[PDB]
Scaffold this motif. Sequence first.
Motif, PDB file in Angstrom:
ATOM      1  N   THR A 338       0.768  -1.237   0.083  1.00  0.00           N
ATOM      2  CA  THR A 338      -0.010  -0.150   0.165  1.00  0.00           C
ATOM      3  C   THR A 338       0.796   1.407  -0.114  1.00  0.00           C
ATOM      4  O   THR A 338       2.052   0.971   0.192  1.00  0.00           O
ATOM      5  CB  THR A 338      -1.089  -0.150   1.159  1.00  0.00           C
ATOM      6  N   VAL A 339       0.344   2.501  -0.301  1.00  0.00           N
ATOM      7  CA  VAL A 339       1.157   3.564  -0.260  1.00  0.00           C
ATOM      8  C   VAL A 339       0.559   4.543   1.163  1.00  0.00           C
ATOM      9  O   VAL A 339      -0.385   5.201   1.006  1.00  0.00           O
ATOM     10  CB  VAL A 339       1.095   4.613  -1.560  1.00  0.00           C
ATOM     11  N   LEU A 340       1.394   4.802   2.085  1.00  0.00           N
ATOM     12  CA  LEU A 340       1.129   5.498   3.243  1.00  0.00           C
ATOM     13  C   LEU A 340       1.591   7.213   2.696  1.00  0.00           C
ATOM     14  O   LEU A 340       2.569   7.616   2.518  1.00  0.00           O
ATOM     15  CB  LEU A 340       2.107   5.411   4.467  1.00  0.00           C
ATOM     16  N   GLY A 341       0.496   7.875   2.774  1.00  0.00           N
ATOM     17  CA  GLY A 341       0.344   9.410   2.814  1.00  0.00           C
ATOM     18  C   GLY A 341       0.603   9.723   1.421  1.00  0.00           C
ATOM     19  O   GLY A 341       0.876  10.764   1.341  1.00  0.00           O
ATOM     20  N   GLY A 342       0.186   8.971   0.468  1.00  0.00           N
ATOM     21  CA  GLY A 342       0.396   9.333  -1.000  1.00  0.00           C
ATOM     22  C   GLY A 342       1.930   9.655  -1.240  1.00  0.00           C
ATOM     23  O   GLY A 342       2.226  10.361  -2.009  1.00  0.00           O
ATOM     24  N   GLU A 343       2.906   9.095  -0.462  1.00  0.00           N
ATOM     25  CA  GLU A 343       4.261   9.323  -0.480  1.00  0.00           C
ATOM     26  C   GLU A 343       5.074   8.208  -0.014  1.00  0.00           C
ATOM     27  O   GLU A 343       6.152   8.284  -0.690  1.00  0.00           O
ATOM     28  CB  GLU A 343       4.462  10.482   0.410  1.00  0.00           C
ATOM     29  N   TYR A 344       4.718   7.399   0.680  1.00  0.00           N
ATOM     30  CA  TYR A 344       5.734   6.350   1.280  1.00  0.00           C
ATOM     31  C   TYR A 344       5.214   4.935   1.014  1.00  0.00           C
ATOM     32  O   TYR A 344       4.404   4.290   1.439  1.00  0.00           O
ATOM     33  CB  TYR A 344       5.763   6.445   2.927  1.00  0.00           C
ATOM     34  N   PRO A 345       5.846   4.272  -0.249  1.00  0.00           N
ATOM     35  CA  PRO A 345       5.440   2.886  -0.421  1.00  0.00           C
ATOM     36  C   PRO A 345       6.106   1.950   0.704  1.00  0.00           C
ATOM     37  O   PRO A 345       7.307   2.066   1.108  1.00  0.00           O
ATOM     38  CB  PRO A 345       6.477   2.513  -1.603  1.00  0.00           C
ATOM     39  N   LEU A 346       5.012   0.969   1.039  1.00  0.00           N
ATOM     40  CA  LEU A 346       5.305  -0.015   2.095  1.00  0.00           C
ATOM     41  C   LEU A 346       4.957  -1.497   1.504  1.00  0.00           C
ATOM     42  O   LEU A 346       3.990  -1.439   0.709  1.00  0.00           O
ATOM     43  CB  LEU A 346       4.331   0.196   3.370  1.00  0.00           C
ATOM     44  N   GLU A 347       5.923  -2.353   2.029  1.00  0.00           N
ATOM     45  CA  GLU A 347       5.718  -3.703   1.412  1.00  0.00           C
ATOM     46  C   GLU A 347       4.702  -4.295   2.513  1.00  0.00           C
ATOM     47  O   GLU A 347       5.111  -4.200   3.563  1.00  0.00           O
ATOM     48  CB  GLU A 347       7.009  -4.220   1.267  1.00  0.00           C
ATOM     49  N   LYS A 348       3.980  -5.119   2.100  1.00  0.00           N
ATOM     50  CA  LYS A 348       3.247  -6.234   3.025  1.00  0.00           C
ATOM     51  C   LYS A 348       4.020  -6.759   3.988  1.00  0.00           C
ATOM     52  O   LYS A 348       5.093  -7.413   3.743  1.00  0.00           O
ATOM     53  CB  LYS A 348       2.721  -7.585   2.183  1.00  0.00           C
ATOM     54  N   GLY A 349       3.658  -6.655   5.322  1.00  0.00           N
ATOM     55  CA  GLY A 349       4.376  -7.194   6.435  1.00  0.00           C
ATOM     56  C   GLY A 349       5.365  -6.075   7.123  1.00  0.00           C
ATOM     57  O   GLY A 349       5.766  -6.366   8.385  1.00  0.00           O
ATOM     58  N   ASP A 350       5.325  -4.970   6.692  1.00  0.00           N
ATOM     59  CA  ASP A 350       6.193  -3.905   7.019  1.00  0.00           C
ATOM     60  C   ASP A 350       5.416  -3.208   8.213  1.00  0.00           C
ATOM     61  O   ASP A 350       4.364  -3.204   8.230  1.00  0.00           O
ATOM     62  CB  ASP A 350       6.336  -2.816   5.839  1.00  0.00           C
ATOM     63  N   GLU A 351       6.430  -3.037   9.232  1.00  0.00           N
ATOM     64  CA  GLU A 351       5.893  -2.489  10.667  1.00  0.00           C
ATOM     65  C   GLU A 351       5.947  -0.881  10.688  1.00  0.00           C
ATOM     66  O   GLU A 351       6.633  -0.131  10.066  1.00  0.00           O
ATOM     67  CB  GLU A 351       7.042  -3.213  11.688  1.00  0.00           C
ATOM     68  N   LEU A 352       5.133  -0.478  11.425  1.00  0.00           N
ATOM     69  CA  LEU A 352       4.845   0.846  11.830  1.00  0.00           C
ATOM     70  C   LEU A 352       4.521   0.881  13.417  1.00  0.00           C
ATOM     71  O   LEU A 352       4.170  -0.067  14.167  1.00  0.00           O
ATOM     72  CB  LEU A 352       3.507   1.326  11.395  1.00  0.00           C
ATOM     73  N   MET A 353       5.345   1.986  13.803  1.00  0.00           N
ATOM     74  CA  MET A 353       5.351   2.269  15.497  1.00  0.00           C
ATOM     75  C   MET A 353       4.515   3.560  15.492  1.00  0.00           C
ATOM     76  O   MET A 353       4.947   4.526  14.885  1.00  0.00           O
ATOM     77  CB  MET A 353       6.529   2.411  16.341  1.00  0.00           C
ATOM     78  N   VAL A 354       3.539   3.781  16.264  1.00  0.00           N
ATOM     79  CA  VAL A 354       2.655   4.752  16.234  1.00  0.00           C
ATOM     80  C   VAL A 354       3.117   5.503  17.826  1.00  0.00           C
ATOM     81  O   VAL A 354       2.866   4.754  18.827  1.00  0.00           O
ATOM     82  CB  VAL A 354       1.100   4.653  16.585  1.00  0.00           C
ATOM     83  N   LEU A 355       3.822   6.609  17.676  1.00  0.00           N
ATOM     84  CA  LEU A 355       4.242   7.346  18.708  1.00  0.00           C
ATOM     85  C   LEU A 355       3.252   8.351  19.441  1.00  0.00           C
ATOM     86  O   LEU A 355       3.043   9.382  19.125  1.00  0.00           O
ATOM     87  CB  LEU A 355       5.475   7.889  18.242  1.00  0.00           C
TER      88      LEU A 355
END
Length: 454
Positions: A338-355
């Motif tokens: 998927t594309v995060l924020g119309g700017e950051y390509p992410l691959e399936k399984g890619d980790e995010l941390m919400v600060l």
Amino acid sequence: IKEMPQPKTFGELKNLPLLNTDKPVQALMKIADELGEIFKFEAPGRVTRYLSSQRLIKEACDESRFDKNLSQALKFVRDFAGDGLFTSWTHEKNWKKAHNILLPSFSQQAMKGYHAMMVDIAVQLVQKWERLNADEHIEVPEDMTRLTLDTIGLCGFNYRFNSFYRDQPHPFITSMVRALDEAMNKLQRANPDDPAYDENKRQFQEDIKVMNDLVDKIIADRKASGEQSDDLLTHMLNGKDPETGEPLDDENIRYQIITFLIAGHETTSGLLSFALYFLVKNPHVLQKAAEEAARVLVDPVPSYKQVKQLKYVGMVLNEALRLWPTAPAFSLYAKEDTVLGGEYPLEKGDELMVLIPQLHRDKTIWGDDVEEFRPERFENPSAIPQHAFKPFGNGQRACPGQQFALHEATLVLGMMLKHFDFEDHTNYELDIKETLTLKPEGFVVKAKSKKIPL
Ligand code: MNH
Ligand SMILES: CCCCCCCCCCCCCCCC(=O)N[C@@H](Cc1ccccc1)C(=O)O
């Protein structure tokens, strides 16, 4: 399509030595303040991305696109909390099963049932403080932990930890706190199987035995009486999931008890600690909360209905959670490319941390006064955009104890403001201690009784 910032690296260790600290969340907050709404953090054979903006977090919170991930932190807690609700994957059978079995423990009928038990521990807190001698102070986090552990023990498991009969912490607390400590101190470790940690490993095992020994006693104490007290333990032992029609097995109940004892008190303890810190450093806000307490709590014993009337104490609690969410991060993984924020390509399984604390300081949402303690921000809850305030996580993996925790906090703060005047007699310098969770350390006050009978 833009590239993410990254903080300073240390060769082969990449970003790992930046968590070489007893305050990692606070160090990551300082990095978020440098690099803005997103940064890449690398360790040997790992990458994650730290989100700080409401713009990116409202996407991350799209349950169609991201699911709850277990951070390294939660993966270490899982060594004692297993497949309990906090440390289970959404796709493990026991996640939805438990969630289904245990949510009715948080019905409005159950809450009204817990109220009297919460009042029981709260009265023990007011009496402790009423009984102090002139010029004796209160150890605030230590006492809030007495209340919150006792409250979840009693409400959840009809078990008395009797924390106010100890001048030392309950042994469960000592073992829990040092387990959470070891979980956090493992994160920063380049060489975890270096024999210089052979001790830490044995202390961690010892600390898990204490926690399981207390679980044995809670279960024995109930299977003796056979109550069905319409409490958390009743459902754990007797609830059938309407989906599978199955009850929880013995191994999962143990993990659920460990899970609800820790999650059910530690973060509420921090909340009350932070709420009282902000009140003493902000006397206008203290006086407005104290006036509400005195006007609403007309009876020697707060009623369920009267806790629901303490709107301003509620706003104090939300504002305390804005600045210092006591569970300060949650992790997500991309369900698909998927594309995060119309700017950051992410691959399936890619980790995010919400600060969460950076989110709560997003000036594009909260205005330029983000650091000021202004409960009035929460007078009108609609004016807060979707996914701006996330101290309780997100969607189906959100906090199931949210109403419990705030009912507890509201009841106990209401009774505190009703019965005492507070004095920041040390002029306390905030020192925030990290055990994955957050809490003020060394925070003390004096409480002059207003002499209102109980
Ligand atoms: C203030 C008090 C307080 C805060 C700040 C709080 C914060 C959170 C956050 C954040 C998450 C999501 C974590 C993640 O990895 O996504 C969460 C999940 C949870 N918390 Mn609650 N937690 C409680 C009080 C709070 N919890 C209380 C009270 C209980 C129990 C009575 C509790 C039991 C849970 C459980 C269980 C989960 C896991 C829910 C799930 O994934 O099914 N808790
Ligand atoms: C039932 C048990 C309840 C326990 C509740 C405790 C959890 C609440 C908050 C956890 C947030 C902690 C944040 C930790 C810091 C962090 O961002 N760690 C991350 C990042 C990391 C990256 C590489 C190597 C190690 C670590 C992580 O654990 O993955």
